[PDB]
Amino acid sequence: HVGFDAVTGEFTGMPEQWARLLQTSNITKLEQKKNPQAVLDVLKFYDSNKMTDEEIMEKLRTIVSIGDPKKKYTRYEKIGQGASGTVFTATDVALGQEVAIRQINLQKQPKKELIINEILVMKELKNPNIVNFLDSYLVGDELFVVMEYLAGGSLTDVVTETCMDEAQIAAVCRECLQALEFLHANQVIHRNIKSDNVLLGMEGSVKLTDFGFCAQITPEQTMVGTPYWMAPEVVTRKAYGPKVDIWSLGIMAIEMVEGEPPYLNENPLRALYLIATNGTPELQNPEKLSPIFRDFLNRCLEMDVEKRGSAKELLQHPFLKLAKPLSSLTPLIMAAKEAM
Amino acid sequence: TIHVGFDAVTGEFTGMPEQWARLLQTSNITKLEQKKNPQAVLDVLKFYDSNTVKMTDEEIMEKLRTIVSIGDPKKKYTRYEKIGQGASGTVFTATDVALGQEVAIRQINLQKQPKKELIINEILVMKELKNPNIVNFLDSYLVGDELFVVMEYLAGGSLTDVVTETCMDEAQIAAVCRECLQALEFLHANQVIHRNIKSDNVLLGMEGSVKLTDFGFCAQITPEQGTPYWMAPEVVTRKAYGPKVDIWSLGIMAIEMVEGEPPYLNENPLRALYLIATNGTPELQNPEKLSPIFRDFLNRCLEMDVEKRGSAKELLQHPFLKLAKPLSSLTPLIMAAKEAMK
Numbered sequence: 001h002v003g004f005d006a007v008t009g010e011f012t013g014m015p016e017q018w019a020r021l022l023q024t025s026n027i028t029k030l031e032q033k034k035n036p037q038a039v040l041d042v043l044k045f046y047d048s049n050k051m052t053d054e055e056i057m058e059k060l061r062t063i064v065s066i067g068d069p070k071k072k073y074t075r076y077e078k079i080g081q082g083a084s085g086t087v088f089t090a091t092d093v094a095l096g097q098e099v100a101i102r103q104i105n106l107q108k109q110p111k112k113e114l115i116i117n118e119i120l121v122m123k124e125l126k127n128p129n130i131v132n133f134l135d136s137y138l139v140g141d142e143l144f145v146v147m148e149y150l151a152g153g154s155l156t157d158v159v160t161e162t163c164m165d166e167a168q169i170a171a172v173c174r175e176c177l178q179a180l181e182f183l184h185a186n187q188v189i190h191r192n193i194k195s196d197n198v199l200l201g202m203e204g205s206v207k208l209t210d211f212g213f214c215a216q217i218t219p220e221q222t223m224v225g226t227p228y229w230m231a232p233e234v235v236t237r238k239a240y241g242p243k244v245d246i247w248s249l250g251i252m253a254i255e256m257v258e259g260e261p262p263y264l265n266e267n268p269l270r271a272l273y274l275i276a277t278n279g280t281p282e283l284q285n286p287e288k289l290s291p292i293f294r295d296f297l298n299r300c301l302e303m304d305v306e307k308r309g310s311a312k313e314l315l316q317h318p319f320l321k322l323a324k325p326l327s328s329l330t331p332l333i334m335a336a337k338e339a340m
Numbered sequence: 341t342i343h344v345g346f347d348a349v350t351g352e353f354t355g356m357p358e359q360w361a362r363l364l365q366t367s368n369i370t371k372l373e374q375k376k377n378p379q380a381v382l383d384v385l386k387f388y389d390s391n392t393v394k395m396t397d398e399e400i401m402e403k404l405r406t407i408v409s410i411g412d413p414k415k416k417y418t419r420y421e422k423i424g425q426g427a428s429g430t431v432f433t434a435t436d437v438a439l440g441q442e443v444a445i446r447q448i449n450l451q452k453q454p455k456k457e458l459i460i461n462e463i464l465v466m467k468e469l470k471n472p473n474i475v476n477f478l479d480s481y482l483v484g485d486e487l488f489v490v491m492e493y494l495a496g497g498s499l500t501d502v503v504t505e506t507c508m509d510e511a512q513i514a515a516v517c518r519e520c521l522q523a524l525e526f527l528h529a530n531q532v533i534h535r536n537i538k539s540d541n542v543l544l545g546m547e548g549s550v551k552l553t554d555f556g557f558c559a560q561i562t563p564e565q566g567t568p569y570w571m572a573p574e575v576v577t578r579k580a581y582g583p584k585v586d587i588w589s590l591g592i593m594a595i596e597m598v599e600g601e602p603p604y605l606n607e608n609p610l611r612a613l614y615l616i617a618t619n620g621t622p623e624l625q626n627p628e629k630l631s632p633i634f635r636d637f638l639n640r641c642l643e644m645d646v647e648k649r650g651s652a653k654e655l656l657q658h659p660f661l662k663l664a665k666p667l668s669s670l671t672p673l674i675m676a677a678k679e680a681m682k
Contacts, residue, residue, distance in 0.1 A: 001421055001433075002419075002421070003421070004419075004421075037422065040422075050625070111606065113606050114606040117368075117606060117607065117608070120368060121366055121368075121608075124365055124366040124368075125366060185359075185362075186362060186363060186366055187363075187609070218567065218606060218607070218608065218609060219566050219567050219609065220606075236425065237424075238425055238426050239426050239427070
């Protein structure tokens, strides 16, 4: 243990592991004397990046179908290789609908029984604003888990390739809040609200995705990238409630006027440092947008956790009543795709 | 409030709120289990909404009279190492200047602490209940809005660090149960109910001493009033409870020690309260490997019946505790858990 620094001096009592992370970073020694505890919390954060065959079968007895996913599905394009599975995107050979396919090796899985029990829960959670469950298939030792997918891409390729005005953002943010309203009421914390994980349909539809399933279903729980979307309570390894998702939605709206999120420029350690120390990132260009929007941002991005809004309160915000109908998003999907 | 009856036996629900039947569907609670135990299902639904569980500044300065010393805690102590922070308050290690001996410091707020008289009255009562098996109060300072509480420091971590290594055979378990019971005899002889006996409130030394804390400040001192594996069936069904809720919890803790994991671990929280209500005892994974005297010790702690459940005195005389190794035998376990903590 035994670690702090000298005031106007340097750290003493630190591992070589943490001192190397500190040196190879962009965190300048001014920024280390400025707030040495915030340094110590981000390093500690950065370092934290018996079921036999009859048991597995009887928990799977309600999700598995018979059928061959290699005949039933095509356009197999790899999309993800998260720590708890692989994620393909595929096309249903009948009916033409696009699908997500999660491939889980059961025999090699760390903590199989929870991975399975989470599937049993989203099987019982239907909402129009989340990707619903479709089917599972057992292939030898390799569970396949099929999910909804939507034709129009992510929010990201819209956000980075057109210009959304406030009433189109109001439509999208009101959709997400209905999802978090339902989700948080059934005791789930999403933990990963960002633009890559919002899926748009061609009709204008908004659905919310956790294909890595890094979602708190039971009490439990950064090579997941530069973590711009994380709330301040997350990164001090303070314990956290569902209010972190309200913060992460507020970072998504900044991405939706600036075109990009704050702190995506910089590497994850300095970026984690900045979330801890700056608090609210709101300052980028406040004159380009209305008073009625900025008050919505200042209830999403509160520092006091009780001062932050919950999803049900924020659904009655007057910025949300600006919302254009969802079909207004339709040409923006098209404009991204021909750019190619 | 909205009301629910269950249409007598061999029968269903009506009056069921829209809110509850979603959380009961995604419980993985089968519609058959609901028919067998309708009352017990109704009770854990009511408990799950109550959750796990005004004052003038003149009144506060009355109660702080006997416990607050004057002095600057930032002069009296140094080398503050922040360990954790959050809801109960920021927890620290510090070194005494005068004594040269390490201490724990709980920096608690007072203006933003709801129901702050529950914690002030715990400190007042527990200040004078000194035991070798519970961790003793040392000092306190009022710094602005924050009351720094100085507590005795135990270097051997907690029992959770040991049990996540799982190397405890029945000799080493039985000594740790012996120390817990000695604390529980004291607490109940002085009208305290701990209510949260679990492996995070058992604090070890290097030489193997075992001591009890009440972090989070939840303990009955005057008769009134995560996923909770330690809770007895009478608490979880919103029935009435007495000092034998603690005896149930130490029974749950011997299973956590004998298996390396809390029971009900990666299962649903509301369905966990269903299984405590109706079955009560958690099923042991490999009962072949536990000696019958130990199994009889568990059947004596984890009785559903309260009067048949043994008291703090009675289980102290239970022969299972005579299998106990010296407390020095814990020292390799503690040192290995702290080394594997890297």
